[PDB]
Symmetry: C4
Subunit: 346 residues, 4 copies
Amino acid sequence: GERVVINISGLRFETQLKTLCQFPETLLGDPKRRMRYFDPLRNEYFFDRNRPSFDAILYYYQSGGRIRRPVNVPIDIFSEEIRFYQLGEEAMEKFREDEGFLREEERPLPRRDFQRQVWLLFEYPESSGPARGIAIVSVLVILISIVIFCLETLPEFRDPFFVVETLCIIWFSFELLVRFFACPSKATFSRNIMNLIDIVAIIPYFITLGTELALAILRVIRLVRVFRIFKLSRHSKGLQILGQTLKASMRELGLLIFFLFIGVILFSSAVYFAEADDPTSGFSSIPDAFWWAVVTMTTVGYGDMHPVTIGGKIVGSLCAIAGVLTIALPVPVIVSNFNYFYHRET
Amino acid sequence: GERVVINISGLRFETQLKTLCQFPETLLGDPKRRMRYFDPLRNEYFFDRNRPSFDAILYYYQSGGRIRRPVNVPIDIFSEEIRFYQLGEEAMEKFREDEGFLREEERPLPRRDFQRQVWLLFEYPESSGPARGIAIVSVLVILISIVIFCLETLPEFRDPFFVVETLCIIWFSFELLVRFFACPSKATFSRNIMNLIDIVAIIPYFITLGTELALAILRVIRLVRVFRIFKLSRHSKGLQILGQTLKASMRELGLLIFFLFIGVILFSSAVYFAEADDPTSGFSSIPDAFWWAVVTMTTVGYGDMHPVTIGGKIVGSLCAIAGVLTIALPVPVIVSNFNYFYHRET
Amino acid sequence: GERVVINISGLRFETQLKTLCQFPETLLGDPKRRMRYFDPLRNEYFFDRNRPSFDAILYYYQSGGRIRRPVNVPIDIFSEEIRFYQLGEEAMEKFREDEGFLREEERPLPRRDFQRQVWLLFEYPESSGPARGIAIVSVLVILISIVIFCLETLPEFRDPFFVVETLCIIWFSFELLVRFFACPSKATFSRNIMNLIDIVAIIPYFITLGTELALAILRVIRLVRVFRIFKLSRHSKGLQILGQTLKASMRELGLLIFFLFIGVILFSSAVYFAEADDPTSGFSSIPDAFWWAVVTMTTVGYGDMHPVTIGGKIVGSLCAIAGVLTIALPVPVIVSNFNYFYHRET
Amino acid sequence: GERVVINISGLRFETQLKTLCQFPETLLGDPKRRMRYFDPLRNEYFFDRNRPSFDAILYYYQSGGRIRRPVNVPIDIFSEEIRFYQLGEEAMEKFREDEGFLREEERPLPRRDFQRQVWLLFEYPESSGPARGIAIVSVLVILISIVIFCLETLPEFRDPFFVVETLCIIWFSFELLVRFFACPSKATFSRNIMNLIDIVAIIPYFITLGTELALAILRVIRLVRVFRIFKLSRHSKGLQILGQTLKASMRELGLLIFFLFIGVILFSSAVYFAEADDPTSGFSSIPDAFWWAVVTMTTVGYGDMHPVTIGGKIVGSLCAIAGVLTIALPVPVIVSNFNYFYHRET
Ligand SMILES: [K+]
Ligand SMILES: [K+]
Ligand SMILES: [K+]
């Protein structure tokens, strides 16, 4: 039933020896490290230190390791108070996990001299000079492949285009093979999103050459060749934050599309029933005002043609207001996700 | 005039025995449960516990049951401190009512073996496999009734449509009767909004069949058949949150419509008086610029036709600014109501 | 050099007798009211009370009347602690002036039996039944005068209109005379904004009748007859909050108009210089793209006609982005003013 | 091993004499200034003062000069507590640098009687009457030069314009020479942005006169004459805040333009591939839907012409939603920068 008096510069605390011996790897736990500060006469351990920090430290032992920082104590002061009390790296990364920093992982490096040099050359551009050369050459090759895609579909042209496209495909396949064979773990390579993007960027050229030298299919292939824009996400950090934002916000995008569908059916029905007994109106069905309701609710504008009645113009006024209301509701959640993932960098 | 000294790990509190005996059902109220911690020599009750939590607990007795959590104490720590002090379930749900959680109701179940099984089968879809089957069949029947409504009004057609519509009405009436006759309390059934929606979804078919086998009326009936979209609110949780948001925000919607009316009258008057002495302008009245002012203030756009004078274009510039200002003012209150009801789920 | 020990339920405070006698109208100031709580043996004044509240109360005397509420003490608890300490109504309305409530004025009533009855009948509608009758009759007369204004300017008509307009003017002048002759202070009557609005609502009828029974002038008079919409601000509380918002935000409205002017001159110059060597473009001057730049920056839309070059479409893309940026900057300050004046009601 | 007891009105603190002597220029550091408050009997220094402020002051010595204000202490109370403790102007501007006020610089004045008078006359308009006269004359000359620029390019005219333009250039060069020769430090003059703006405002007149009395070049010169709008930034404080905002937000503007480029390429590709097998569609290439995708994503509107298929209208619906999402993401960071630099004035 022995007690112990800990005096943090005038603010006197008291507890049991069991609570101090529950963590016998800290400053106050072992009976010899804390006799550094013991005063024989006053029977107390005088720590000329910080007082709100010590009431948080004393709660950590009582809570059996549950941790929190008081709201009136700054992070650096509390950090070096944890360090002074030598609570433990367990308690330190508990405090980090509690505050919410993502400082937990360090990705490995290949176990050889040759692999380490080519993997750090082709993967980490901040290292060397040749690394920045590979980065700038890669961004330029991606940009000219986009230009070749759009110029292919111009009507003055429809071969130099096949030669430029096959040079771009040679460079893409070359750096994909070099990145694959120089990686540390091949089990991780078929889980990165960017390596899947590079594979889908080089596939349709090879299947076109195969079936060409051996309706919906060829339209799918000509629209799947547009996924070479997403090869810029390796060199752009705002695009990676945009992908993280869009993955964290999938319920809000579904709600946006669902609310717009409900409003389009409702206001198309209303404007068609308001303009049926008028032979000079343009709405001939309810599936004919769908596009008018979409461009009125989003505020793009349908052009000169307008409802022609009085009830149709009252319905159009309500459609223009209701779209602003409908769209403005799930969008602050998506911009909060963006602000979170974006300022997480600092 | 006896005092009592309560020592929360060094932080010494003092009060009267009357204040402790005012709640004689707690830990400190009865004279035998709190002699667990009484120290005979120091004449104090040593609780090796949390200090800001205890100043809140000591205030609860003094305030005669008024409760609050200090701003520097987290909710779980204060919750188990209330639990340790055994303040009472009265004090615990007072603390819950103070913080503002809606954890108060549990809706009943029918008092029989048969009724409980069919009511939980047709009302709670998360229970069983047949429950999810009934849910998916119901959503599919609602969707094909919407498709039948719009395809009915196409002009290439205007019978398979009557057969599909009467099958949909048979399913709606069947599940309405099964939900009605299997419910616990029939006094609650004519107060849910969704049961009223189901009744209005099946009424106009039956009154059309009745008066057909026995202007504004038939137009009202053909526009009241569109309320089958709101039968999706039973299966969608975002739509229920949208209804709660729109009911909590009825003053702000009235202010939005009132501000837009004031602006439409004002800017229509101004643009007509700016373009009266010009024979090539299109505004022939003040009730002819109402629609131009609506689409300019909302930013939809009126199309190619524009004011034709210099004063008319100065008035149009001010209309385009004033609509943004007018609309942007009552909308943050509606999106705060949405964020409240939406994150209330977690 | 006498000290005094004040013991707030265990938390011991200490000060000088000079600091307590500096306010000798309070509980601790006079030497007989505070001997209610003095303990002769322990030489202290035991107040079984609230501890953070007492450190704020002890600071009030030291600061010579400067007051503040601690951030960890709620408003009702601190209010009744001020009341318990009987600091003074001076200190109580200092605390109210510090927190920022507008509970300071009570507007007078006429000093007679007859004047008090007609002034409360015609000014305060929440009193009686005839008061609500006068309110509803007034709103209906204002609404039919607005309808008469717009129907006057229709072209099928251009007398019942003169009879309806002269009945509306008789009612406006009647209630203006009754409100003027029944008011308590006639010095305040020519400072309310609403009485000036009523005078401007009845003036142009009388000057038209005078000069008619005795270009810019008559156009000014026909546009000054539109100020009868603002007679609804007496019966509407959202419109009064809108007027307070617009008066508090006059620097931000000037910045909005100035930023839009800078952008219109800049992008009109750029699009004209990008499309000068092309005979099929529509911009013939820099003062001919002013209206295109206004409707592109505000997002209303100019219609089918578009820049016709490549440099003109690059300039148009930048105009569409820059308007969103320019407009979005001074608008959160205006909506914060609105939220302040609007939630000030509760 | 001597200790010292400091009693802040009942709240007793304790520390070592080394910690107090570490700053021997303050109130508690020198052994004679603090014997003002020493009580010989109780062996303590009684400061009838503020208690949370003193725990912050005691931490300052322990942290070796690191400073912070507690979150529960207001700024004026803590300021005069620092002043009472005479911590030092070093500690006072450390506290100011910690809170984040920009009260650090005072710009010099010329070292002569004549230079000081003309520099304060032509640079500081708030001083005198002639200073405000120079300010109003300068703003009027800038405004008529803008009017001359636009009226020059009207087609009814294309000499009074050369005379008005040469008078404006004489005034600009005159005040530039007077401001240059009367300044204190000529090393600072070629680093202000506004003096560079004045030089670029007077250059192209002189090079036109030189090469005229001695394609892309003359188009560059006729578009560089538009930089006379930015001479209003000396007389306008909202424009200076806009320039500070736009310089602090250069990463967010690049992200806005990059996200819009990605979306334009994506939705142009999709709408062209959705409308290729239809001879009545208007999209003939992917570089022909670029402008439609820009005006649909920004909500300006493309006019009457619309996608003509069903897949094209589904793609157009997604384009109209995706632009709102894309644009709304980096814009709250720019408006937070604006609010910061704008309310920094108060
Ligand atoms: K538009
Ligand atoms: K728009
Ligand atoms: K349009």
